[PDB]
Amino acid sequence: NARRDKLKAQIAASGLDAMLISDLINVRYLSGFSGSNGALLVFADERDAVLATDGRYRTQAASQAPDLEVAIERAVGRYLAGRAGEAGVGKLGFESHVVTVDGLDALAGALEGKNTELVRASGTVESLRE
Amino acid sequence: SNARRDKLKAQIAASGLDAMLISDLINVRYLSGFSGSNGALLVFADERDAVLATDGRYRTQAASQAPDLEVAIERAVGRYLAGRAGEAGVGKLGFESHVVTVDGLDALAGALEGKNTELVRASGTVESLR
């Protein structure tokens, strides 16, 4: 995907190994998925992106984003942060303009005992637009 | 005096806080009557009256909807009220960590830089009164 590939270049330029996208405008831009709950994990390297949504959107994610692995989970951001930690991501960008303080605590909890740092990265996806 | 703010004051004190910043618009409306699209409310545990902050669009609206309150007219309502809490000697200031973003918290902390006031998560507090 051309947009996700442009994002990878910016992720790498920002000194990150992956980015968690939580803003639904940005999720839609990068994946084509338009459900009201969703998050996307994009890696700096050649690994493919992972979309997470809840059960309401299983069919929709399959039709809108057939190129992506889709996880069906109650807490989509948290799930993806946990995936990032398990994938050995050193620095994981997140969107501080939309993630709540409670939400960040959950992301951090999913990374306990992993050497993954959560790094403010709002603006990274926006940098790709006109 | 407001019956709703009085319940909040009792809860603020029970949680060990000296005041709480309300950022959520639905909760601001519940506690003050003010229904404008930008606003925040500072509520003290002690006998001090609450302070509403809103931008200049809403000077007339706030005065009419919440006539019992001091209304501060400010561009950046969260920063303003956090600073105000700092100046009022507030030891522990609760904030709505279930809706305040990581960016939002950064702004509040910035407003309190060099002051003794601790920002304390107060997730779902107004909602716990109903």
Q: Can you describe this structure?
A:
Two copies of one chain form a homodimer. Chain A has 130 residues and is of the alpha/beta class. Chain A has one domain (1-130): Creatinase/prolidase N-terminal domain (Creatine Amidinohydrolase, Chain A, domain 1, 3-Layer(aba) Sandwich), CATH 3.40.350.10. In chain A, 37% of the residues lie in helices and 19% in strands. Chain A contains five helices and six strands. Chain A has helices at 2-13, 24-31, 58-64, 76-86, 101-110; strands at 18-21, 39-43, 50-53, 69-72, 91-94, 117-120. In chain A, strands 4-3-2-1-5-6 form a six-stranded mixed β-sheet, with helices on both faces. In chain A, strand 3 (50-53), helix 3 and strand 4 form a beta-alpha-beta unit. In chain A, helix 4 (76-86) runs parallel beside helix 5. The A-B interface holds A 94, 96-102, 104-105, 120, 122 and B 95, 97-106, 121, 123. It is classed as hydrolase. The entry lists the keywords Midwest Center for Structural Genomics, Structures of Mtb Proteins Conferring Susceptibility to Known Mtb Inhibitors, hydrolase. It forms a dimeric assembly. The entry is titled "Crystal structure of N-terminal domain of cytoplasmic peptidase PepQ from Mycobacterium tuberculosis H37Rv".
